[PDB]
Design a protein around this motif. Sequence first.
Motif, PDB file in Angstrom:
ATOM      1  N   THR A  22      13.415  -1.739 -17.196  1.00  0.00           N
ATOM      2  CA  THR A  22      14.228  -2.894 -17.506  1.00  0.00           C
ATOM      3  C   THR A  22      13.720  -4.215 -16.900  1.00  0.00           C
ATOM      4  OG1 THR A  22      15.792  -2.682 -15.642  1.00  0.00           O
ATOM      5  CG2 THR A  22      16.195  -1.327 -17.563  1.00  0.00           C
ATOM      6  N   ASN A  23      13.133  -4.169 -15.697  1.00  0.00           N
ATOM      7  CA  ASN A  23      12.724  -5.414 -15.033  1.00  0.00           C
ATOM      8  C   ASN A  23      11.329  -5.918 -15.362  1.00  0.00           C
ATOM      9  OD1 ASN A  23      15.195  -4.723 -13.889  1.00  0.00           O
ATOM     10  ND2 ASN A  23      14.449  -4.589 -11.791  1.00  0.00           N
ATOM     11  N   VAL A  24      10.356  -5.012 -15.414  1.00  0.00           N
ATOM     12  CA  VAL A  24       8.971  -5.414 -15.662  1.00  0.00           C
ATOM     13  C   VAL A  24       8.274  -4.616 -16.752  1.00  0.00           C
ATOM     14  CG1 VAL A  24       8.646  -6.376 -13.362  1.00  0.00           C
ATOM     15  CG2 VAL A  24       8.246  -3.884 -13.758  1.00  0.00           C
ATOM     16  N   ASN A  25       9.068  -4.097 -17.673  1.00  0.00           N
ATOM     17  CA  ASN A  25       8.558  -3.295 -18.794  1.00  0.00           C
ATOM     18  C   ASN A  25       7.549  -2.230 -18.333  1.00  0.00           C
ATOM     19  OD1 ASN A  25       6.793  -3.763 -22.030  1.00  0.00           O
ATOM     20  ND2 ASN A  25       8.536  -2.429 -21.481  1.00  0.00           N
ATOM     21  N   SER A  26       7.828  -1.601 -17.192  1.00  0.00           N
ATOM     22  CA  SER A  26       6.983  -0.524 -16.686  1.00  0.00           C
ATOM     23  C   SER A  26       5.586  -0.944 -16.237  1.00  0.00           C
ATOM     24  CB  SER A  26       6.852   0.588 -17.755  1.00  0.00           C
ATOM     25  OG  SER A  26       8.119   1.048 -18.249  1.00  0.00           O
ATOM     26  N   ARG A  27       5.320  -2.244 -16.126  1.00  0.00           N
ATOM     27  CA  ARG A  27       3.988  -2.688 -15.729  1.00  0.00           C
ATOM     28  C   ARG A  27       3.729  -2.448 -14.230  1.00  0.00           C
ATOM     29  NH1 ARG A  27       5.575  -6.888 -16.668  1.00  0.00           N
ATOM     30  NH2 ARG A  27       6.432  -7.825 -18.586  1.00  0.00           N
ATOM     31  N   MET A  28       4.775  -2.446 -13.419  1.00  0.00           N
ATOM     32  CA  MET A  28       4.629  -2.209 -11.983  1.00  0.00           C
ATOM     33  C   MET A  28       5.777  -1.307 -11.578  1.00  0.00           C
ATOM     34  SD  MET A  28       3.562  -6.059 -11.024  1.00  0.00           S
ATOM     35  CE  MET A  28       3.437  -6.022  -9.466  1.00  0.00           C
ATOM     36  N   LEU A  29       5.757  -0.762 -10.356  1.00  0.00           N
ATOM     37  CA  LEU A  29       6.822   0.121  -9.911  1.00  0.00           C
ATOM     38  C   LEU A  29       7.793  -0.718  -9.078  1.00  0.00           C
ATOM     39  CD1 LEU A  29       4.942   3.433  -8.930  1.00  0.00           C
ATOM     40  CD2 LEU A  29       6.175   2.837 -11.080  1.00  0.00           C
ATOM     41  N   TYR A  30       8.988  -0.885  -9.638  1.00  0.00           N
ATOM     42  CA  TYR A  30      10.061  -1.691  -9.046  1.00  0.00           C
ATOM     43  C   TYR A  30      10.918  -0.880  -8.102  1.00  0.00           C
ATOM     44  CZ  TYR A  30      13.367  -5.734  -9.237  1.00  0.00           C
ATOM     45  OH  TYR A  30      14.252  -6.785  -9.015  1.00  0.00           O
ATOM     46  N   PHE A  31      10.363  -0.566  -6.937  1.00  0.00           N
ATOM     47  CA  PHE A  31      11.109   0.211  -5.954  1.00  0.00           C
ATOM     48  C   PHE A  31      12.318  -0.575  -5.487  1.00  0.00           C
ATOM     49  CE2 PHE A  31       8.368   3.837  -5.476  1.00  0.00           C
ATOM     50  CZ  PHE A  31       7.017   3.440  -5.497  1.00  0.00           C
ATOM     51  N   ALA A  32      12.116  -1.867  -5.253  1.00  0.00           N
ATOM     52  CA  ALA A  32      13.226  -2.740  -4.876  1.00  0.00           C
ATOM     53  C   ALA A  32      12.784  -4.180  -5.222  1.00  0.00           C
ATOM     54  CB  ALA A  32      13.510  -2.609  -3.352  1.00  0.00           C
ATOM     55  N   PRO A  33      13.735  -5.127  -5.275  1.00  0.00           N
ATOM     56  CA  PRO A  33      13.421  -6.520  -5.594  1.00  0.00           C
ATOM     57  C   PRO A  33      12.364  -7.042  -4.624  1.00  0.00           C
ATOM     58  CG  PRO A  33      15.796  -6.187  -5.619  1.00  0.00           C
ATOM     59  CD  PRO A  33      15.165  -4.955  -4.957  1.00  0.00           C
ATOM     60  N   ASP A  34      12.399  -6.535  -3.385  1.00  0.00           N
ATOM     61  CA  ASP A  34      11.476  -6.973  -2.352  1.00  0.00           C
ATOM     62  C   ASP A  34      10.370  -5.954  -2.051  1.00  0.00           C
ATOM     63  OD1 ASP A  34      13.264  -5.183  -1.182  1.00  0.00           O
ATOM     64  OD2 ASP A  34      13.321  -6.298   0.714  1.00  0.00           O
ATOM     65  N   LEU A  35      10.179  -5.004  -2.963  1.00  0.00           N
ATOM     66  CA  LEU A  35       9.090  -4.040  -2.769  1.00  0.00           C
ATOM     67  C   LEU A  35       8.635  -3.605  -4.167  1.00  0.00           C
ATOM     68  CD1 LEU A  35       7.454  -2.575  -0.637  1.00  0.00           C
ATOM     69  CD2 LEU A  35       9.173  -0.727  -0.684  1.00  0.00           C
ATOM     70  N   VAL A  36       7.835  -4.455  -4.795  1.00  0.00           N
ATOM     71  CA  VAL A  36       7.312  -4.155  -6.137  1.00  0.00           C
ATOM     72  C   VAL A  36       5.840  -3.785  -5.986  1.00  0.00           C
ATOM     73  CG1 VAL A  36       6.895  -5.035  -8.485  1.00  0.00           C
ATOM     74  CG2 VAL A  36       8.911  -5.754  -7.167  1.00  0.00           C
ATOM     75  N   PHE A  37       5.469  -2.611  -6.467  1.00  0.00           N
ATOM     76  CA  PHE A  37       4.104  -2.134  -6.337  1.00  0.00           C
ATOM     77  C   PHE A  37       3.218  -2.505  -7.517  1.00  0.00           C
ATOM     78  CE2 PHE A  37       3.381   1.533  -3.090  1.00  0.00           C
ATOM     79  CZ  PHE A  37       4.217   0.902  -2.140  1.00  0.00           C
ATOM     80  N   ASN A  38       2.224  -3.345  -7.258  1.00  0.00           N
ATOM     81  CA  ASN A  38       1.198  -3.663  -8.263  1.00  0.00           C
ATOM     82  C   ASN A  38       0.100  -2.628  -8.033  1.00  0.00           C
ATOM     83  OD1 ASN A  38      -0.085  -4.554  -5.849  1.00  0.00           O
ATOM     84  ND2 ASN A  38       0.464  -6.682  -6.220  1.00  0.00           N
ATOM     85  N   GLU A  39      -0.990  -2.678  -8.815  1.00  0.00           N
ATOM     86  CA  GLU A  39      -2.076  -1.692  -8.649  1.00  0.00           C
ATOM     87  C   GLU A  39      -2.714  -1.743  -7.249  1.00  0.00           C
ATOM     88  OE1 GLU A  39      -2.508   0.443 -12.465  1.00  0.00           O
ATOM     89  OE2 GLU A  39      -4.377   0.192 -11.287  1.00  0.00           O
ATOM     90  N   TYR A  40      -2.742  -2.931  -6.647  1.00  0.00           N
ATOM     91  CA  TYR A  40      -3.354  -3.025  -5.331  1.00  0.00           C
ATOM     92  C   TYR A  40      -2.497  -2.175  -4.359  1.00  0.00           C
ATOM     93  CZ  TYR A  40      -5.469  -4.781  -1.065  1.00  0.00           C
ATOM     94  OH  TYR A  40      -6.118  -4.916   0.149  1.00  0.00           O
ATOM     95  N   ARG A  41      -1.176  -2.345  -4.414  1.00  0.00           N
ATOM     96  CA  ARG A  41      -0.264  -1.577  -3.548  1.00  0.00           C
ATOM     97  C   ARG A  41      -0.306  -0.069  -3.831  1.00  0.00           C
ATOM     98  NH1 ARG A  41       4.955  -5.658  -2.744  1.00  0.00           N
ATOM     99  NH2 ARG A  41       4.003  -6.821  -0.933  1.00  0.00           N
ATOM    100  N   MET A  42      -0.464   0.316  -5.108  1.00  0.00           N
ATOM    101  CA  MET A  42      -0.577   1.719  -5.447  1.00  0.00           C
ATOM    102  C   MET A  42      -1.777   2.224  -4.665  1.00  0.00           C
ATOM    103  SD  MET A  42      -0.080   1.586  -9.473  1.00  0.00           S
ATOM    104  CE  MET A  42       1.318   0.626 -10.155  1.00  0.00           C
ATOM    105  N   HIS A  43      -2.870   1.476  -4.664  1.00  0.00           N
ATOM    106  CA  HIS A  43      -4.025   1.933  -3.955  1.00  0.00           C
ATOM    107  C   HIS A  43      -3.899   1.905  -2.442  1.00  0.00           C
ATOM    108  CE1 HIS A  43      -7.973   1.383  -2.017  1.00  0.00           C
ATOM    109  NE2 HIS A  43      -8.412   2.240  -2.924  1.00  0.00           N
ATOM    110  N   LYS A  44      -3.400   0.804  -1.889  1.00  0.00           N
ATOM    111  CA  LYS A  44      -3.300   0.747  -0.434  1.00  0.00           C
ATOM    112  C   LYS A  44      -2.287   1.705   0.198  1.00  0.00           C
ATOM    113  CE  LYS A  44      -5.138  -1.723   2.202  1.00  0.00           C
ATOM    114  NZ  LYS A  44      -3.683  -1.920   2.419  1.00  0.00           N
ATOM    115  N   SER A  45      -1.314   2.135  -0.586  1.00  0.00           N
ATOM    116  CA  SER A  45      -0.314   3.050  -0.074  1.00  0.00           C
ATOM    117  C   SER A  45      -0.879   4.449   0.012  1.00  0.00           C
ATOM    118  CB  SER A  45       0.885   3.030  -0.999  1.00  0.00           C
ATOM    119  OG  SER A  45       0.503   3.604  -2.246  1.00  0.00           O
ATOM    120  N   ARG A  46      -2.037   4.639  -0.633  1.00  0.00           N
ATOM    121  CA  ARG A  46      -2.741   5.915  -0.725  1.00  0.00           C
ATOM    122  C   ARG A  46      -1.849   6.890  -1.497  1.00  0.00           C
ATOM    123  NH1 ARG A  46      -4.687   6.637   5.613  1.00  0.00           N
ATOM    124  NH2 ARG A  46      -5.336   4.438   5.895  1.00  0.00           N
TER     125      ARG A  46
END
Length: 246
Positions: free
Chosen positions: A85-109
């Motif tokens: 609903t928020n970003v058409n599935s382009r990123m993972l919307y864990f919370a308004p203040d914690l949205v995972f882009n591809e860089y975060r997917m990678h750094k989170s391991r």
Amino acid sequence: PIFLNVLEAIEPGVVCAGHDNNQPDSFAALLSSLNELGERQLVHVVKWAKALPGFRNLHVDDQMAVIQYSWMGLMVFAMGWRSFTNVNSRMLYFAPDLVFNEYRMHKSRMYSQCVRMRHLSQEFGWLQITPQEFLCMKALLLFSIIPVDGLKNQKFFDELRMNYIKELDRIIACKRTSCSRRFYQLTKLLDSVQPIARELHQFTFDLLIKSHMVSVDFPEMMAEIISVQVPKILSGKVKPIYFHTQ
Ligand SMILES: CC[C@]1(O)CC[C@H]2[C@@H]3CCC4=CC(=O)CCC4=C3C=C[C@@]21CC
């Protein structure tokens, strides 16, 4: 629609992670913000579950048990919906203040796990899932994982699960072969949550065990759950209930 009225009424509002979006992204900080969000969500999942129609029919012990076993899947499912609903599935919307882009997917391991979660999110779009189908599916997901040797009072649980399946079928028929292809689609989607939750259980369990050394913090409530309930699932003592053969 008494049933749907209740589900919308009890649906949790926005939950924030408290993450510092000003700090450079790092493994420790990202995983520590996710764990804190997990604790915050868990609090909301319990109040939500306890307000569900018929929930008090379950034995007191069985109530917490089904909440603890389904927590992970429930978090993933709702997170997939929020991302849709928020970003058409382009990123993972864990919370308004914690949205995972591809860089975060990678750094989170947690890259491979995030791929699987984002795919789930895309299916809400591909299948054109309605907000009411989402609410009904998510309530049923709570009643989708049990001990192989059963609950304290399995009959109350089987009756409650049966009623939530019937409600899902009902919201379907309201506007509808068609229904059947639809029920088939939704049950396949519900099943697909289980393998994703299993990967996350393995991942959080492994992280808890090595957490002393990778500087990742785990709040008390979950560390309890991760060391006491999650191993029951990973050791095959507690298993998901699938609609279709796996
Ligand atoms: C290191 C993060 C981690 O332990 C691994 C998988 C994480 C899961 C992933 C699924 C999820 C969806 C949400 O909307 C809230 C928070 C949430 C988690 C938090 C912490 C966990 C589970 C307790």
